């Protein structure tokens with residue numbers, strides 16, 4: 001059910017943060033939901049601040065849009081930036097001021113694993129073009145769990161590693177030829193890395209693709225809008241086959257078309 005990205009639609013705002021604390025952040029659903037969660041369970045993390053620990057959890061989409069949280073997790077570890085994902089019942093996030101990825105089982109609220117991403121730059125070393133301590137960007141696609149980062153050895157270019165979702169061991173690593181700080185964000189669809197770059201605060205384009213299957217790179221032009229002029233997060237959800245983004249207090253989704 002895969003294919004290559006050929007179109008990104010216009011943003012649909014699902015919810016707007018109540019306070020300036022939610023100016024940027026990350027919101028997520030589980031592409032492989034596990035009991036007691038479902039494909040509707042939605043997690044939200046406002047990442048404005050210096051000690052981010054609160055994760056808001058909504059059982060229903062209707063609730064995410066108009067109601068209150070079902071549960072609020074207080075993370076044991078401090079969370080960094082907006083690269084986190086939820087996958088198979090666990091929140092995967094980066095420890096504040098570290099290159100450590102943490103697996104946090106949501107239903108038991110237990111940390112199942114913590115692992116340094118070998119050689120990965122962190123806390124401002126290899127951020128996306130706009131900064132934001134976005135050095136490390138987790139991703140989920142049709143094949144499982146990934147991490148997007150860079151190293152001194154890769155010369156600041158985007159590196160991507162397939163991760164073991166249980167213990168976070170790196171299974172395979174790819175080195176691209178695109179400077180990570182040259183793009184505003186990135187995501188993976190069907191084993192292909194796509195990067196997004198911004199001409200302005202409101203105008204963006206999917207501008208580059210790297211196929212992990214062939215190691216073949218390619219330049220693209222797939223325009224789309226940052227309606228609210230400050231996009232801090234853009235991820236792909238392989239279940240819904242849509243892009244989830246956070247844009248200036250607004251949690252939005254994008255329709256896409258695959259070949």
Ligand SMILES: [Ca+2]
Nearest residue numbers: 137186234235
């Ligand atoms: Ca991303």
Ligand code: NA
Nearest residue numbers: 083084137138
């Ligand atoms: Na991410």
